[PDB]
């Protein structure tokens, strides 16, 4: 039952959700009003980043006190990302070291 | 110039990128081989989460030593997310407190 001033979750992609507040389009700044958007979008204000964007109604769901479903989902993905960076940097060097080692063996 | 065993960045959505390694489809497990996917996808292995998925060639870019563009982009978005959660929880309570206060005034 979406409405202006409501706190909501916005799907930014399949692996990214973000809390925001739905804006009345009559209330946002002129330069936000004039941003091209798809017919039937409404504006939200994203917390943390503090910027406005027009969004599809299909990508916006109510923020419900207590239900940390979206929040915990996001933080635990975001945490794993750190591990992912170190693993990839590690794998990248091993693979590079192998490539370099074979290359060295091909040069007299 | 993508190839098997290459370390890459995968766009999971517009606000999510993830490091992975491209797999030879002949080398991944049977149950990954048999997962329905779009024609012209290839499999990657995602670091951190350690799971395989079939991806569109258009969403995969080389991981380049030194170029922390994707990495820094992701972590700084991921950091802001924390601020976003606290801001939204704060705003949600204020708005709720207002709604509750008006409701109280309407009941004798």
Curated annotation (Swiss-Prot), chains A, B:
Q: In which tissues is it expressed?
A: Highly expressed in brain, heart and skeletal muscle. Expressed at lower level in liver and lung.
Q: Where in the cell is it found?
A: Nucleus; Chromosome
Q: Domain PWWP: where? A: 4-66
Coiled-coil region(s): 77-108
The UniProt subunit note reads as follows: Interacts with BRD4. Interacts (via KIKL motif) with BRD3 (via NET domain).
Its job:
Histone methyltransferase. Preferentially dimethylates 'Lys-4' and 'Lys-27' of histone H3 forming H3K4me2 and H3K27me2. H3 'Lys-4' methylation represents a specific tag for epigenetic transcriptional activation, while 'Lys-27' is a mark for transcriptional repression.
Family, similarity comment? Belongs to the class V-like SAM-binding methyltransferase superfamily. Histone-lysine methyltransferase family. SET2 subfamily.
Cite the domain annotation text: The KIKL motif recognizes and binds the NET domain of BRD3.
Q: Which disease does the record tie it to?
A: Defects in NSD3 may be involved in non small cell lung carcinomas (NSCLC). Amplified or overexpressed in NSCLC.
* Name the UniProt record assigns to this protein: Histone-lysine N-methyltransferase NSD3
Organism the protein comes from: Homo sapiens (Human)
* Lineage of source species: Eukaryota, Metazoa, Chordata, Craniata, Vertebrata
Gene name for this UniProt entry: NSD3
Q: Give the fragment's position in the full-length protein.
A: 957 to 1064 of 1437
């Amino acid at each position: 039952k979406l409405h202006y001033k409501q706190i909501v979750w916005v799907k930014l992609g399949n692996y990214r959700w973000w809390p925001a507040e739905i804006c009345n389009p009559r209330s946002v700044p002129l330069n936000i009003q004039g941003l091209k958007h798809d017919l039937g979008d409404f504006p939200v204000f994203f917390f943390g980043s503090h910027d406005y964007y027009w969004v599809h109604q299909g990508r916006v769901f109510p923020y419900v006190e207590g239900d940390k479903s979206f929040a915990e989902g996001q933080t635990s993905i975001n945490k794993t990302f750190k591990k992912a960076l170190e693993e990839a940097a590690k794998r990248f060097q091993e693979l590079k070291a192998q490539r370099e080692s074979k290359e060295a063996l091909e040069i007299e």
